[PDB]
């Protein structure tokens, strides 16, 4: 809910807008539209009944707070929460005050008459707060809703079904002039028809090809829909997404990025990066685009490019020299360096396997308790021997966690099979060819 009632505990009364020149108080009534308010920017509180913003004529003491036409550049319409429930103008020690019983006033006192809460709760007004709502479909290419907006010479404060029940908004204040609109990312009858569902996995995908947002704007649009940018974690998922996007050509943002400075490629939804499908030549630009014109393969671009995007909604005894953690025994070998398959065999001769890693806590145990050194480079069990570009663990356990080094995974089109190693001060992983003599990390039950 975006609409709240401004409440003062001490008087047990609520702000009520009577006219554009009168903002009084009255007995609280949630069924009275004149008492409902809403944020429309980082700093502006707007009346729902009148579609006018609360403001002041000057930043001076004891002036009347009345309703002004909303202006995102007006210093006199910007409100911020101070201390806790203190509400005051931006940049001054002047406060939203209950006023003399003989209209709401801007006053210098910070007493109980200047502390306001959202009716029905115990949180300040800034708790609801304004979040930009990126639009879906429409002609505005995913631009943000503009509140308030004018449609057929009426003012609208929230998303409307005015003019099937689909909720929409104008992305500029005068929709009657600019004719720019989009649909709101809210639940309504028919909202789920914006999502395409994979019958097999029950995961829903939303393809927003008409839009043109930056990578970060795209990430916000999915997250405000209780989703996240597309992560492609398995061969079936890529196959389905190739089918959905066969009839498209323009690039679409997906969640694969390398924006974290100490680590490499990762999905924004923290899914494991175990399936690769780069376009020939990539990765040569820290954000990844899916190119539906080239069979839905991936290429990395500058994160400020304006593209479409895809959202995704859904999901106690150890031998000698072996050390325990979480019901398993681990050991690092450095004596005789072996290639990956010879190391795989030696772990199995010893009763275990090349190590799998499923949680970050398990990764931390290896780099700090097993004698691991920062200059090391050790085999682990992740590999794509069977299917190129699809990493699996040699012990058959699921890949639920990946921590790639900066600049990793590297060059997969330079070789025919990829084994991965553990190297660096953080124990992050890097893939490489398998015919290299190296140390290795074994793990057993």
Swiss-Prot record:
Domain of life of the organism encoding this protein: Eukaryota
Subunit structure: (Microbial infection) Interacts with Dengue virus.
Record-given protein name: Macrophage mannose receptor 1
Domain notes from UniProt: The C-type lectin domains, also called carbohydrate-recognition domains or CRDs, 1-3 have at most very weak affinity for carbohydrates. C-type lectin domain 4 shows the highest affinity binding and has multispecificity for a variety of monosaccharides. At least 3 C-type lectin domains (4, 5, and 7) are required for high affinity binding and endocytosis of multivalent glycoconjugates.
Organism: Homo sapiens
Record domain Fibronectin type-II: where: 140-186
Glycosylation sites: 83, 315
Disulfide-bond pairs as recorded: 14-28, 53-70, 145-169, 159-184, 222-311, 287-303, 347-442, 419-434
Boundaries of every Ricin B-type lectin domain copy: 1-119
UniProt subcellular location: Endosome membrane; Cell membrane
Function (record text): Mediates the endocytosis of glycoproteins by macrophages. Binds both sulfated and non-sulfated polysaccharide chains. (Microbial infection) Acts as a phagocytic receptor for bacteria, fungi and other pathogens.
Residues in C-type lectin domain copies: 200-312, 325-443
